[PDB]
Amino acid sequence: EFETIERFMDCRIGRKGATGATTTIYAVEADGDPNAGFEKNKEPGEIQYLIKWKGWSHIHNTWETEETLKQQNVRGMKKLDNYKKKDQETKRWLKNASPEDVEYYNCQQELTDDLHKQYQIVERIIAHSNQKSAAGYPDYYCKWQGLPYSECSWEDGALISKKFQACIDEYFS
């Protein structure tokens, strides 16, 4: 029973403890962002990485530290070392580059950020489970915006209904 890092999505100095399940986009929507109002130079912070997990869709991405990754015994830890290398190489480059380059870099980061956001949006629902929860919710097989059909995933119906009820209505139309 272990989790595997699929991809490092982002990196920040965040409030200590703002990691794990409370940082998913749906936890934040429901309960507020654990990193809200964090100001780097007035409160203790830590390096945190946004993780896309193998076998979990992008809505389940979480912020993690090197420490939490190790404590949870996740697989794919070689990707951390690679990420830290690329990051240090990128930061060296930024320090000298002409703002003409910095501009192009920033543009590619913004386009990338926008792409990543799409991955967390249900484009349409493809199928629903026969089994339903006590509360009557089936699970839903979801096609994600900007991802191919191979990246569809089963999702908790109660969770999907909080934000994508229109997709549900459309599927049952």
């Binding site: 979990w56 489970s129 839903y140």
Partner: peptide, 12 residues
């Protein structure tokens, strides 16, 4: 002991 086998989860 025979090893036996929903696909939907959430981060808890």
């Amino acid at each position: 002991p025979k090893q036996k086998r929903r696909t939907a989860r959430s981060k808890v």
